[PDB]
Amino acid sequence: KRRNTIHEFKKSAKTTLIKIDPALKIKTKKVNTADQCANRCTRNKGLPFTCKAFVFDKARKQCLWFPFNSMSSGVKKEFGHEFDLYENKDYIRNCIIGEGESYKGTVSITKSGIKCQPWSSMIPHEHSFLPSSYRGKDLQENYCRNPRGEEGGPWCFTSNPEVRYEVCDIPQCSEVECMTANGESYRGLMDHTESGKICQRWDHQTPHRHKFLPERYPDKGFDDNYCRNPDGQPRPWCYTLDPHTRWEYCAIKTCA
């Protein structure tokens, strides 16, 4: 099979999600691995809603797909060794990657400080940027989006009737992401190599085999697919999802 999208998720071990508010339905299915839950969560037309997070029950072997994450309203985290929560990074972001096409955070205020207009609303500014016309772009509520992958970055229509649209001020992910020395103590959230290749998850042996087992190295920060320096390398690094590139250095600026 070809689909491999589990890297796109932030894992919270021993955690499941419950929503107090019974609204927003959930789909559950008997599935063998967490990888299959992830591919279904990120697939186009895979679920009767936009999947933001999922939980893999390891004991019962089930996926639990949610249209919400742990940062939504009326949703609690709950304990259980058999559970593993996975939240799509796009909705946690807080920062931007390049044009910010993948950005799906909760910023709803323009660069000037004006509240964004709802995307599904024609007031004050009528338009054609509707969720129906741009599936997969998460044109929900009044959050800053970059649907057409334009140079300016994430933008929105403005609540002020005098300004139609404006860009939003969201910093590039390489903004606060800095390291001390050779990055031995770096525990940040960088997940792509210096050439822009996507990092392989540490808790995975595909497509590259390695000895850096998260269970074997607590305190080493082998979470998700973040760039790490666990072996005295000149710079932090990660294994790559490209079969023809085992590993590659990451580009994290020094805090000094």
Side-chain angles (χ1 to χ4, degrees):
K1 200 66 202 67
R2 210 70 53 204
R3 14 152 273 194
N4 182 210
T5 56
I6 190 162
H7 66 271
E8 295 177 22
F9 292 87
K10 181 197 170 186
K11 191 180 84 183
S12 291
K14 307 175 194 303
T15 313
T16 184
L17 287 183
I18 300 161
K19 199 180 181 180
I20 292 98
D21 203 56
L24 278 73
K25 44 246 84 179
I26 298 158
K27 181 64 193 287
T28 82
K29 193 191 176 183
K30 285 282 174 183
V31 163
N32 204 41
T33 53
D35 297 68
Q36 305 170 49
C37 308
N39 287 158
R40 182 79 179 266
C41 182
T42 57
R43 207 194 315 282
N44 290 296
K45 89 185 89 174
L47 297 162
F49 51 82
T50 298
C51 184
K52 284 182 176 65
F54 76 85
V55 165
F56 182 66
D57 191 319
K58 291 182 282 195
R60 295 171 187 90
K61 286 174 180 174
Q62 271 190 326
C63 317
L64 320 166
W65 294 288
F66 321 115
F68 56 82
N69 56 42
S70 66
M71 289 166 183
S72 298
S73 297
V75 41
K76 278 216 305 173
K77 285 188 178 183
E78 223 65 76
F79 177 78
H81 288 107
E82 67 271 50
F83 303 117
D84 279 327
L85 171 58
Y86 292 84
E87 296 170 286
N88 201 295
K89 293 167 169 189
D90 295 347
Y91 308 95
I92 322 162
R93 279 277 79 89
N94 87 64
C95 60
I96 252 70
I97 305 163
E99 339 75 15
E101 307 184 69
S102 53
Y103 177 75
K104 288 167 182 178
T106 59
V107 171
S108 66
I109 288 95
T110 62
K111 195 190 188 74
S112 294
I114 332 152
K115 188 193 171 188
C116 288
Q117 177 186 326
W119 292 93
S120 293
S121 176
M122 304 283 94
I123 297 166
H125 319 289
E126 86 157 44
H127 61 272
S128 56
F129 287 91
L130 274 80
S132 315
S133 306
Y134 294 91
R135 183 179 189 165
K137 269 75 178 67
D138 200 64
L139 297 182
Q140 300 294 305
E141 301 187 58
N142 65 328
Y143 305 124
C144 296
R145 297 292 97 107
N146 196 352
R148 285 181 176 171
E150 295 171 44
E151 188 190 306
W155 62 280
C156 71
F157 293 96
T158 302
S159 286
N160 189 330
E162 287 201 334
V163 268
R164 188 168 217 274
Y165 56 82
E166 199 193 335
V167 291
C168 308
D169 194 62
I170 323 158
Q172 291 279 340
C173 286
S174 61
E175 92 286 321
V176 83
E177 215 66 285
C178 70
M179 68 188 188
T180 311
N182 294 344
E184 212 87 48
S185 62
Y186 174 83
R187 225 105 314 190
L189 306 172
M190 180 90 297
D191 52 0
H192 77 264
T193 73
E194 63 167 52
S195 74
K197 288 190 182 81
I198 302 158
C199 294
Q200 177 187 312
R201 277 184 140 269
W202 300 101
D203 63 1
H204 273 68
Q205 297 290 308
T206 326
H208 305 299
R209 317 149 298 171
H210 66 100
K211 306 309 289 294
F212 295 105
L213 267 287
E215 282 98 356
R216 289 210 282 206
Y217 306 96
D219 308 339
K220 222 78 175 171
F222 294 127
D223 294 285
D224 306 319
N225 62 334
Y226 307 129
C227 294
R228 293 290 177 265
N229 190 4
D231 56 339
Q233 289 292 105
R235 283 172 198 162
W237 57 275
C238 69
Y239 298 101
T240 308
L241 284 184
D242 172 32
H244 307 297
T245 313
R246 160 168 265 261
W247 70 275
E248 196 170 288
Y249 290 107
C250 302
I252 309 153
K253 65 177 186 184
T254 48
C255 303

mmCIF file of all heavy atoms in Angstrom, residues 85-127:
data_model
loop_
_atom_site.group_PDB
_atom_site.id
_atom_site.type_symbol
_atom_site.label_atom_id
_atom_site.label_comp_id
_atom_site.label_asym_id
_atom_site.label_seq_id
_atom_site.Cartn_x
_atom_site.Cartn_y
_atom_site.Cartn_z
ATOM 1 N N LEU A 85 -4.080 8.763 21.797
ATOM 2 C CA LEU A 85 -4.673 9.888 21.079
ATOM 3 C C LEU A 85 -3.730 10.417 20.001
ATOM 4 O O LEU A 85 -2.537 10.590 20.240
ATOM 5 C CB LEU A 85 -5.061 11.008 22.055
ATOM 6 C CG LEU A 85 -5.516 12.379 21.533
ATOM 7 C CD1 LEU A 85 -6.735 12.280 20.620
ATOM 8 C CD2 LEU A 85 -5.798 13.316 22.696
ATOM 9 N N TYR A 86 -4.281 10.662 18.815
ATOM 10 C CA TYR A 86 -3.545 11.266 17.711
ATOM 11 C C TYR A 86 -4.304 12.483 17.194
ATOM 12 O O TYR A 86 -5.441 12.363 16.739
ATOM 13 C CB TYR A 86 -3.352 10.265 16.572
ATOM 14 C CG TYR A 86 -2.427 9.107 16.873
ATOM 15 C CD1 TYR A 86 -2.894 7.966 17.525
ATOM 16 C CD2 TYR A 86 -1.088 9.142 16.485
ATOM 17 C CE1 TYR A 86 -2.050 6.896 17.796
ATOM 18 C CE2 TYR A 86 -0.234 8.075 16.752
ATOM 19 C CZ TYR A 86 -0.723 6.957 17.407
ATOM 20 O OH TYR A 86 0.113 5.900 17.673
ATOM 21 N N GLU A 87 -3.670 13.649 17.273
ATOM 22 C CA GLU A 87 -4.258 14.898 16.794
ATOM 23 C C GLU A 87 -3.480 15.415 15.591
ATOM 24 O O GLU A 87 -2.254 15.528 15.646
ATOM 25 C CB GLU A 87 -4.243 15.957 17.900
ATOM 26 C CG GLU A 87 -5.097 15.636 19.116
ATOM 27 C CD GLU A 87 -4.849 16.600 20.259
ATOM 28 O OE1 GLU A 87 -3.791 16.494 20.918
ATOM 29 O OE2 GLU A 87 -5.712 17.469 20.502
ATOM 30 N N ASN A 88 -4.192 15.731 14.510
ATOM 31 C CA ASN A 88 -3.567 16.276 13.305
ATOM 32 C C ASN A 88 -2.896 17.617 13.598
ATOM 33 O O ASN A 88 -3.527 18.534 14.131
ATOM 34 C CB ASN A 88 -4.590 16.409 12.171
ATOM 35 C CG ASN A 88 -3.941 16.468 10.793
ATOM 36 O OD1 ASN A 88 -3.216 17.409 10.470
ATOM 37 N ND2 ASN A 88 -4.215 15.462 9.970
ATOM 38 N N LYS A 89 -1.613 17.709 13.256
ATOM 39 C CA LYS A 89 -0.776 18.874 13.563
ATOM 40 C C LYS A 89 -1.315 20.182 12.996
ATOM 41 O O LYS A 89 -1.079 21.251 13.562
ATOM 42 C CB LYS A 89 0.644 18.661 13.041
ATOM 43 C CG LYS A 89 1.424 17.567 13.736
ATOM 44 C CD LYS A 89 2.666 17.234 12.939
ATOM 45 C CE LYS A 89 3.602 16.349 13.718
ATOM 46 N NZ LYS A 89 4.889 16.217 12.999
ATOM 47 N N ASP A 90 -2.032 20.083 11.879
ATOM 48 C CA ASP A 90 -2.576 21.244 11.176
ATOM 49 C C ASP A 90 -3.481 22.117 12.045
ATOM 50 O O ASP A 90 -3.545 23.329 11.851
ATOM 51 C CB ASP A 90 -3.323 20.799 9.914
ATOM 52 C CG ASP A 90 -2.409 20.153 8.884
ATOM 53 O OD1 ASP A 90 -1.169 20.263 9.018
ATOM 54 O OD2 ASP A 90 -2.934 19.537 7.931
ATOM 55 N N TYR A 91 -4.160 21.499 13.008
ATOM 56 C CA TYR A 91 -5.098 22.208 13.882
ATOM 57 C C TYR A 91 -4.458 22.721 15.176
ATOM 58 O O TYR A 91 -5.050 23.544 15.879
ATOM 59 C CB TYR A 91 -6.325 21.336 14.172
ATOM 60 C CG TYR A 91 -6.966 20.784 12.917
ATOM 61 C CD1 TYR A 91 -6.633 19.515 12.443
ATOM 62 C CD2 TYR A 91 -7.889 21.537 12.191
ATOM 63 C CE1 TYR A 91 -7.208 19.006 11.282
ATOM 64 C CE2 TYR A 91 -8.469 21.037 11.030
ATOM 65 C CZ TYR A 91 -8.124 19.771 10.583
ATOM 66 O OH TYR A 91 -8.690 19.268 9.436
ATOM 67 N N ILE A 92 -3.251 22.240 15.480
ATOM 68 C CA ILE A 92 -2.488 22.702 16.645
ATOM 69 C C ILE A 92 -1.496 23.793 16.237
ATOM 70 O O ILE A 92 -1.189 24.688 17.027
ATOM 71 C CB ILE A 92 -1.705 21.552 17.334
ATOM 72 C CG1 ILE A 92 -2.512 20.249 17.331
ATOM 73 C CG2 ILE A 92 -1.307 21.951 18.760
ATOM 74 C CD1 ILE A 92 -1.675 19.001 17.586
ATOM 75 N N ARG A 93 -1.006 23.691 15.000
ATOM 76 C CA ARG A 93 -0.026 24.611 14.395
ATOM 77 C C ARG A 93 0.536 25.727 15.281
ATOM 78 O O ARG A 93 1.674 25.633 15.740
ATOM 79 C CB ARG A 93 -0.581 25.210 13.091
ATOM 80 C CG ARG A 93 -0.462 24.314 11.857
ATOM 81 C CD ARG A 93 0.912 24.403 11.188
ATOM 82 N NE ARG A 93 1.929 23.606 11.877
ATOM 83 C CZ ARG A 93 2.198 22.329 11.612
ATOM 84 N NH1 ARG A 93 1.529 21.679 10.667
ATOM 85 N NH2 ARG A 93 3.142 21.697 12.297
ATOM 86 N N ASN A 94 -0.271 26.769 15.506
ATOM 87 C CA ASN A 94 0.150 28.038 16.138
ATOM 88 C C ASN A 94 1.214 28.823 15.349
ATOM 89 O O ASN A 94 1.388 30.027 15.558
ATOM 90 C CB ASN A 94 0.535 27.861 17.626
ATOM 91 C CG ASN A 94 1.999 27.473 17.830
ATOM 92 O OD1 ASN A 94 2.916 28.232 17.504
ATOM 93 N ND2 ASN A 94 2.220 26.289 18.394
ATOM 94 N N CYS A 95 1.917 28.130 14.454
ATOM 95 C CA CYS A 95 2.901 28.744 13.565
ATOM 96 C C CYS A 95 2.652 28.329 12.116
ATOM 97 O O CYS A 95 1.758 27.524 11.846
ATOM 98 C CB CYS A 95 4.330 28.395 14.000
ATOM 99 S SG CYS A 95 4.750 26.627 14.027
ATOM 100 N N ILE A 96 3.444 28.871 11.192
ATOM 101 C CA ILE A 96 3.232 28.647 9.756
ATOM 102 C C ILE A 96 4.395 27.947 9.047
ATOM 103 O O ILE A 96 5.562 28.140 9.396
ATOM 104 C CB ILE A 96 2.813 29.974 9.030
ATOM 105 C CG1 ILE A 96 1.337 29.925 8.636
ATOM 106 C CG2 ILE A 96 3.607 30.219 7.761
ATOM 107 C CD1 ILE A 96 0.388 29.995 9.791
ATOM 108 N N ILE A 97 4.054 27.118 8.063
ATOM 109 C CA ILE A 97 5.040 26.520 7.167
ATOM 110 C C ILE A 97 4.888 27.144 5.779
ATOM 111 O O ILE A 97 3.919 26.867 5.067
ATOM 112 C CB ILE A 97 4.895 24.977 7.083
ATOM 113 C CG1 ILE A 97 4.959 24.347 8.480
ATOM 114 C CG2 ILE A 97 5.970 24.384 6.167
ATOM 115 C CD1 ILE A 97 4.433 22.918 8.548
ATOM 116 N N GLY A 98 5.842 28.001 5.416
ATOM 117 C CA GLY A 98 5.853 28.666 4.112
ATOM 118 C C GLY A 98 4.640 29.539 3.849
ATOM 119 O O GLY A 98 4.399 30.518 4.560
ATOM 120 N N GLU A 99 3.875 29.171 2.824
ATOM 121 C CA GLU A 99 2.666 29.899 2.425
ATOM 122 C C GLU A 99 1.542 29.698 3.439
ATOM 123 O O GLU A 99 0.609 30.498 3.509
ATOM 124 C CB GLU A 99 2.178 29.441 1.042
ATOM 125 C CG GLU A 99 3.227 28.757 0.158
ATOM 126 C CD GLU A 99 3.546 27.326 0.594
ATOM 127 O OE1 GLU A 99 2.779 26.741 1.396
ATOM 128 O OE2 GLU A 99 4.577 26.787 0.134
ATOM 129 N N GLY A 100 1.633 28.619 4.212
ATOM 130 C CA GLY A 100 0.622 28.292 5.212
ATOM 131 C C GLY A 100 -0.615 27.666 4.600
ATOM 132 O O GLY A 100 -1.728 27.877 5.085
ATOM 133 N N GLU A 101 -0.415 26.896 3.532
ATOM 134 C CA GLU A 101 -1.502 26.184 2.855
ATOM 135 C C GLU A 101 -2.089 25.116 3.770
ATOM 136 O O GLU A 101 -3.295 24.870 3.762
ATOM 137 C CB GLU A 101 -1.005 25.530 1.562
ATOM 138 C CG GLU A 101 -0.292 26.472 0.602
ATOM 139 C CD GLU A 101 0.086 25.800 -0.707
ATOM 140 O OE1 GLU A 101 -0.827 25.480 -1.501
ATOM 141 O OE2 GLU A 101 1.296 25.604 -0.947
ATOM 142 N N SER A 102 -1.218 24.492 4.557
ATOM 143 C CA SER A 102 -1.608 23.441 5.490
ATOM 144 C C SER A 102 -2.130 23.984 6.823
ATOM 145 O O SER A 102 -2.617 23.214 7.655
ATOM 146 C CB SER A 102 -0.432 22.492 5.733
ATOM 147 O OG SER A 102 0.727 23.209 6.126
ATOM 148 N N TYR A 103 -2.032 25.299 7.024
ATOM 149 C CA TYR A 103 -2.458 25.917 8.282
ATOM 150 C C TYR A 103 -3.960 25.800 8.522
ATOM 151 O O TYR A 103 -4.771 26.190 7.676
ATOM 152 C CB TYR A 103 -2.028 27.385 8.374
ATOM 153 C CG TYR A 103 -2.528 28.067 9.631
ATOM 154 C CD1 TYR A 103 -1.936 27.811 10.866
ATOM 155 C CD2 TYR A 103 -3.606 28.952 9.590
ATOM 156 C CE1 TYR A 103 -2.392 28.426 12.023
ATOM 157 C CE2 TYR A 103 -4.074 29.568 10.748
ATOM 158 C CZ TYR A 103 -3.459 29.300 11.958
ATOM 159 O OH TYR A 103 -3.909 29.900 13.107
ATOM 160 N N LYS A 104 -4.310 25.267 9.692
ATOM 161 C CA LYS A 104 -5.700 25.074 10.101
ATOM 162 C C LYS A 104 -5.888 25.350 11.600
ATOM 163 O O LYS A 104 -6.673 24.679 12.274
ATOM 164 C CB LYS A 104 -6.174 23.662 9.734
ATOM 165 C CG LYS A 104 -6.388 23.451 8.243
ATOM 166 C CD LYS A 104 -6.538 21.986 7.884
ATOM 167 C CE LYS A 104 -6.710 21.825 6.384
ATOM 168 N NZ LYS A 104 -6.825 20.402 5.973
ATOM 169 N N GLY A 105 -5.167 26.351 12.107
ATOM 170 C CA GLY A 105 -5.253 26.761 13.513
ATOM 171 C C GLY A 105 -6.475 27.603 13.838
ATOM 172 O O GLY A 105 -7.443 27.630 13.075
ATOM 173 N N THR A 106 -6.430 28.303 14.970
ATOM 174 C CA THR A 106 -7.606 29.022 15.475
ATOM 175 C C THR A 106 -7.495 30.555 15.469
ATOM 176 O O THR A 106 -8.301 31.237 16.111
ATOM 177 C CB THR A 106 -8.010 28.539 16.895
ATOM 178 O OG1 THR A 106 -6.918 28.733 17.801
ATOM 179 C CG2 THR A 106 -8.403 27.065 16.879
ATOM 180 N N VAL A 107 -6.515 31.092 14.744
ATOM 181 C CA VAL A 107 -6.360 32.545 14.616
ATOM 182 C C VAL A 107 -7.486 33.126 13.755
ATOM 183 O O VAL A 107 -7.666 32.730 12.601
ATOM 184 C CB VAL A 107 -4.962 32.937 14.052
ATOM 185 C CG1 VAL A 107 -4.900 34.421 13.707
ATOM 186 C CG2 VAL A 107 -3.866 32.583 15.049
ATOM 187 N N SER A 108 -8.244 34.055 14.334
ATOM 188 C CA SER A 108 -9.400 34.658 13.666
ATOM 189 C C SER A 108 -9.320 36.187 13.646
ATOM 190 O O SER A 108 -10.337 36.876 13.517
ATOM 191 C CB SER A 108 -10.695 34.201 14.344
ATOM 192 O OG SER A 108 -10.784 34.695 15.670
ATOM 193 N N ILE A 109 -8.102 36.709 13.772
ATOM 194 C CA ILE A 109 -7.860 38.150 13.806
ATOM 195 C C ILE A 109 -6.809 38.526 12.756
ATOM 196 O O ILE A 109 -5.786 37.848 12.620
ATOM 197 C CB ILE A 109 -7.439 38.625 15.233
ATOM 198 C CG1 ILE A 109 -8.628 38.585 16.202
ATOM 199 C CG2 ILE A 109 -6.882 40.037 15.213
ATOM 200 C CD1 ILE A 109 -8.728 37.317 17.037
ATOM 201 N N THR A 110 -7.079 39.600 12.015
ATOM 202 C CA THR A 110 -6.178 40.092 10.968
ATOM 203 C C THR A 110 -4.905 40.720 11.544
ATOM 204 O O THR A 110 -4.794 40.922 12.756
ATOM 205 C CB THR A 110 -6.877 41.129 10.056
ATOM 206 O OG1 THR A 110 -7.272 42.269 10.832
ATOM 207 C CG2 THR A 110 -8.102 40.528 9.390
ATOM 208 N N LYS A 111 -3.953 41.029 10.663
ATOM 209 C CA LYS A 111 -2.690 41.664 11.049
ATOM 210 C C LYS A 111 -2.909 43.001 11.765
ATOM 211 O O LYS A 111 -2.205 43.313 12.728
ATOM 212 C CB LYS A 111 -1.797 41.861 9.819
ATOM 213 C CG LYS A 111 -0.340 42.174 10.131
ATOM 214 C CD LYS A 111 0.410 42.582 8.870
ATOM 215 C CE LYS A 111 1.904 42.720 9.123
ATOM 216 N NZ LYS A 111 2.579 41.398 9.277
ATOM 217 N N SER A 112 -3.888 43.774 11.290
ATOM 218 C CA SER A 112 -4.223 45.077 11.874
ATOM 219 C C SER A 112 -4.896 44.959 13.239
ATOM 220 O O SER A 112 -4.845 45.890 14.045
ATOM 221 C CB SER A 112 -5.122 45.874 10.926
ATOM 222 O OG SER A 112 -4.437 46.213 9.734
ATOM 223 N N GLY A 113 -5.530 43.815 13.490
ATOM 224 C CA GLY A 113 -6.217 43.574 14.754
ATOM 225 C C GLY A 113 -7.728 43.555 14.622
ATOM 226 O O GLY A 113 -8.446 43.701 15.613
ATOM 227 N N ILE A 114 -8.212 43.369 13.397
ATOM 228 C CA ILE A 114 -9.648 43.331 13.135
ATOM 229 C C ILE A 114 -10.129 41.883 13.071
ATOM 230 O O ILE A 114 -9.460 41.025 12.488
ATOM 231 C CB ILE A 114 -10.021 44.060 11.820
ATOM 232 C CG1 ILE A 114 -9.018 45.180 11.506
ATOM 233 C CG2 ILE A 114 -11.443 44.609 11.910
ATOM 234 C CD1 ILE A 114 -8.864 45.486 10.022
ATOM 235 N N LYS A 115 -11.283 41.624 13.682
ATOM 236 C CA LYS A 115 -11.891 40.295 13.694
ATOM 237 C C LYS A 115 -12.231 39.857 12.271
ATOM 238 O O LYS A 115 -12.688 40.664 11.460
ATOM 239 C CB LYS A 115 -13.151 40.297 14.568
ATOM 240 C CG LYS A 115 -13.761 38.920 14.822
ATOM 241 C CD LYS A 115 -15.164 39.027 15.412
ATOM 242 C CE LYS A 115 -15.849 37.663 15.449
ATOM 243 N NZ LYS A 115 -17.288 37.749 15.841
ATOM 244 N N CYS A 116 -11.989 38.583 11.971
ATOM 245 C CA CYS A 116 -12.273 38.030 10.650
ATOM 246 C C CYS A 116 -13.763 37.804 10.432
ATOM 247 O O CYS A 116 -14.499 37.497 11.371
ATOM 248 C CB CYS A 116 -11.526 36.713 10.445
ATOM 249 S SG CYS A 116 -9.747 36.869 10.225
ATOM 250 N N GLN A 117 -14.194 37.971 9.185
ATOM 251 C CA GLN A 117 -15.546 37.633 8.758
ATOM 252 C C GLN A 117 -15.662 36.112 8.649
ATOM 253 O O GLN A 117 -14.699 35.452 8.250
ATOM 254 C CB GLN A 117 -15.852 38.293 7.405
ATOM 255 C CG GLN A 117 -17.222 37.956 6.810
ATOM 256 C CD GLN A 117 -17.423 38.502 5.405
ATOM 257 O OE1 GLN A 117 -16.923 39.573 5.059
ATOM 258 N NE2 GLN A 117 -18.170 37.767 4.588
ATOM 259 N N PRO A 118 -16.828 35.549 9.025
ATOM 260 C CA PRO A 118 -17.082 34.127 8.787
ATOM 261 C C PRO A 118 -17.058 33.798 7.295
ATOM 262 O O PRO A 118 -17.588 34.560 6.485
ATOM 263 C CB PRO A 118 -18.491 33.921 9.352
ATOM 264 C CG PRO A 118 -18.664 34.999 10.346
ATOM 265 C CD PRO A 118 -17.902 36.173 9.819
ATOM 266 N N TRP A 119 -16.439 32.672 6.948
ATOM 267 C CA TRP A 119 -16.292 32.251 5.554
ATOM 268 C C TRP A 119 -17.625 31.922 4.880
ATOM 269 O O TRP A 119 -17.809 32.199 3.691
ATOM 270 C CB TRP A 119 -15.333 31.061 5.449
ATOM 271 C CG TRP A 119 -13.912 31.414 5.782
ATOM 272 C CD1 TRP A 119 -13.308 31.318 7.002
ATOM 273 C CD2 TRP A 119 -12.918 31.928 4.883
ATOM 274 N NE1 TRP A 119 -12.001 31.734 6.921
ATOM 275 C CE2 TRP A 119 -11.736 32.115 5.632
ATOM 276 C CE3 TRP A 119 -12.913 32.246 3.517
ATOM 277 C CZ2 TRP A 119 -10.556 32.607 5.062
ATOM 278 C CZ3 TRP A 119 -11.738 32.735 2.950
ATOM 279 C CH2 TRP A 119 -10.577 32.910 3.724
ATOM 280 N N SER A 120 -18.548 31.338 5.642
ATOM 281 C CA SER A 120 -19.866 30.974 5.122
ATOM 282 C C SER A 120 -20.835 32.159 5.073
ATOM 283 O O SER A 120 -21.965 32.025 4.596
ATOM 284 C CB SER A 120 -20.466 29.820 5.931
ATOM 285 O OG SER A 120 -19.725 28.627 5.745
ATOM 286 N N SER A 121 -20.386 33.314 5.559
ATOM 287 C CA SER A 121 -21.193 34.531 5.545
ATOM 288 C C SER A 121 -20.854 35.439 4.364
ATOM 289 O O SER A 121 -19.700 35.519 3.936
ATOM 290 C CB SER A 121 -21.020 35.300 6.855
ATOM 291 O OG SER A 121 -21.717 36.533 6.817
ATOM 292 N N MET A 122 -21.874 36.120 3.851
ATOM 293 C CA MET A 122 -21.711 37.103 2.783
ATOM 294 C C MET A 122 -21.706 38.529 3.347
ATOM 295 O O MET A 122 -21.649 39.506 2.596
ATOM 296 C CB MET A 122 -22.820 36.948 1.737
ATOM 297 C CG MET A 122 -22.940 35.561 1.102
ATOM 298 S SD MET A 122 -21.697 35.185 -0.153
ATOM 299 C CE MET A 122 -20.449 34.340 0.811
ATOM 300 N N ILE A 123 -21.767 38.637 4.673
ATOM 301 C CA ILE A 123 -21.806 39.926 5.364
ATOM 302 C C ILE A 123 -20.542 40.086 6.214
ATOM 303 O O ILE A 123 -20.211 39.191 6.993
ATOM 304 C CB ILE A 123 -23.085 40.061 6.242
ATOM 305 C CG1 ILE A 123 -24.342 40.019 5.365
ATOM 306 C CG2 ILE A 123 -23.058 41.343 7.082
ATOM 307 C CD1 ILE A 123 -25.637 39.815 6.130
ATOM 308 N N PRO A 124 -19.835 41.226 6.074
ATOM 309 C CA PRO A 124 -20.134 42.373 5.206
ATOM 310 C C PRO A 124 -19.751 42.192 3.734
ATOM 311 O O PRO A 124 -20.308 42.874 2.872
ATOM 312 C CB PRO A 124 -19.299 43.508 5.820
ATOM 313 C CG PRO A 124 -18.855 43.002 7.157
ATOM 314 C CD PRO A 124 -18.727 41.535 6.991
ATOM 315 N N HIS A 125 -18.817 41.288 3.452
ATOM 316 C CA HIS A 125 -18.313 41.109 2.090
ATOM 317 C C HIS A 125 -18.775 39.788 1.481
ATOM 318 O O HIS A 125 -18.441 38.716 1.989
ATOM 319 C CB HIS A 125 -16.783 41.196 2.070
ATOM 320 C CG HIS A 125 -16.227 42.269 2.955
ATOM 321 N ND1 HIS A 125 -16.350 43.612 2.668
ATOM 322 C CD2 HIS A 125 -15.546 42.195 4.123
ATOM 323 C CE1 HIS A 125 -15.772 44.319 3.622
ATOM 324 N NE2 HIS A 125 -15.275 43.483 4.517
ATOM 325 N N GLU A 126 -19.553 39.868 0.402
ATOM 326 C CA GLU A 126 -19.998 38.663 -0.299
ATOM 327 C C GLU A 126 -18.894 38.159 -1.224
ATOM 328 O O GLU A 126 -18.157 38.949 -1.813
ATOM 329 C CB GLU A 126 -21.326 38.880 -1.047
ATOM 330 C CG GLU A 126 -21.222 39.448 -2.459
ATOM 331 C CD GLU A 126 -22.442 39.135 -3.316
ATOM 332 O OE1 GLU A 126 -23.585 39.275 -2.827
ATOM 333 O OE2 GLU A 126 -22.256 38.753 -4.488
ATOM 334 N N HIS A 127 -18.782 36.839 -1.332
ATOM 335 C CA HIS A 127 -17.679 36.208 -2.051
ATOM 336 C C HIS A 127 -18.055 34.808 -2.532
ATOM 337 O O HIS A 127 -19.215 34.402 -2.437
ATOM 338 C CB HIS A 127 -16.443 36.139 -1.150
ATOM 339 C CG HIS A 127 -16.649 35.337 0.097
ATOM 340 N ND1 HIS A 127 -17.138 35.885 1.263
ATOM 341 C CD2 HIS A 127 -16.445 34.025 0.356
ATOM 342 C CE1 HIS A 127 -17.218 34.946 2.188
ATOM 343 N NE2 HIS A 127 -16.805 33.807 1.662
#
